[PDB]
């Protein structure tokens, strides 16, 4: 399993606009369209992002395209963030995927705010990190997904995605 697979397992795939666990209009494989509460805005965003009049629906390849760009964008923000880069560099392959997962979902600035967890991960205090992450709002809003991501940081295995 790799980072992409991990992501695909958590985000799934939708060809029509829907709202994630965060309550935002999203499409394809975890593609955030807008933080705005208006469908019209998301619709606009969609077309803009696509380059054509989608009228609310996209194609599977279109999704795939957005996804590659979104993953690239997650890796890019980590690498450039002074709070994330060192964490990232210090983790093993599987745990790096969990960090990308968080970034992809919440953004560079969101993750960058989990100061203590970040430190704990970097110091290999896996159980401490886990407890800490579970205290967030993120966990209350997207518990299934968050548990999965958390188990990964705690164990460093793919156990949570084994049935995917």
From Swiss-Prot:
Record annotation: effect of changing residue 11 to A/F/H/M/N: Complete loss of enzymatic activity
Family, similarity comment: Belongs to the glycosyl hydrolase 24 family.
EC identifiers of the protein: 3.2.1.17
Binding-site list for substrate: 32, 104, 117, 132
Annotated compartments: Host cytoplasm
Gene induction: Expressed late in the viral replication.
TM annotation in the entry: none
Gene Ontology BP term (one): peptidoglycan catabolic process
GO MF terms held by the record: lysozyme activity
InterPro entries, A to Z: Endolysin_T4_type, Glyco_hydro_24, Lysozyme-like_dom_sf, Lysozyme_dom_sf, Phage_lysozyme-like, T4-type_lysozyme
SUPFAM superfamilies according to UniProt: Lysozyme-like
Originating organism: Enterobacteria phage T4
Domain of life: Viruses
Gene: E
Outcome (variant: residue 26 to H): Facilitates transglycosylation more effectively than hydrolysis; covalently bound substrate
Official protein name in the record: Endolysin
Active site per database record: 11, 20
Coiled-coil regions listed: none
